[PDB]
Every structure is written in C-alpha cells, then in structure tokens.
C-alpha cells in the first residue's frame, strides 16, 4: 500500500501540518483514508480527516460508508499496517499506536478482507 498522500506531499510538510493539527485539537487526530487499490468499491471525495479522539473504530466505519454510499450488506474493512483493528477501539487510541512519523495515522480501506478467505493460487 502506496498511500497518494504521500505522494502528494513531502514528509517535511506532512510532518509540521500533523504537528500544527494535534497541538491546535488536542481532543482530535489526523487521518488519512485510502482505498486499497485493487479493491473494488466507491471511492472517497477527501483523503484527510480530522477525528474526534473519542470516536469509536465502529462510528468511524459508520461514517465512511455513509460517504461511500455503501448499502448495510455491503462488506467494508479497515486496515492499519495491515492489521484490521477492532470496531471498539477509540480513534485516539489507535491513533497512539499506530500514527507515522509526520504524526498522521494511515487507514487504508476495502471490499475484502485476506485475512478471512483462502485463495487457492
């Protein structure tokens, strides 16, 4: 996973712009949400996220499918160094434990999860 982001924007800037963003909310993270490329589902029409820390993993699911437009039987998945994290955790604690060194914390998001299917070849 190549997040565009990152392509968008050097490190030296991502990093002040997610330094400025946790010192001006203390109470919220930055996010950054791309589709994993070969998944096949609806894009988003912003990458960057500024997230109540309190925010549930689950609410956030919530929240970009209504962006997507997904239907409730329509599968979605989060992935964060490519480990799904659970639907009970707080945006700021995953965001403690998982955000880069430009001080973003990377979602990328699918129709699929590996992790539960075995593809044969």
């Known amino acids: 996973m190549k ?3 990152k392509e968008e924007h050097a490190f030296e800037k991502r990093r002040a712009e997610g330094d400025k963003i946790r010192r ?3 109470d919220r993270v930055p996010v950054i949400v791309e589709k994993a490329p070969k998944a096949r589902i609806g894009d988003l029409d912003k990458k960057k996220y500024l997230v109540p820390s309190d925010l549930t993993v689950g609410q956030f ?3 970009i499918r209504k962006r997507i437009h997904l239907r409730p039987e329509d599968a979605l998945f989060f992935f964060v160094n490519n480990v799904i994290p659970p639907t ?3 945006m700021g604690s995953l965001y403690q434990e998982h955000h880069e060194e430009d001080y973003f914390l990377y979602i990328a998001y699918s129709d699929e999860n ?3 299917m075995a593809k044969i070849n």
């Open 88 to 90: 009970s955790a707080t």
């Open 24 to 26: 001006k909310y203390p």
């Open 3 to 5: 997040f565009q982001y």
């Open 114 to 116: 590996v992790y539960g």
């Open 61 to 63: 699911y919530f929240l």
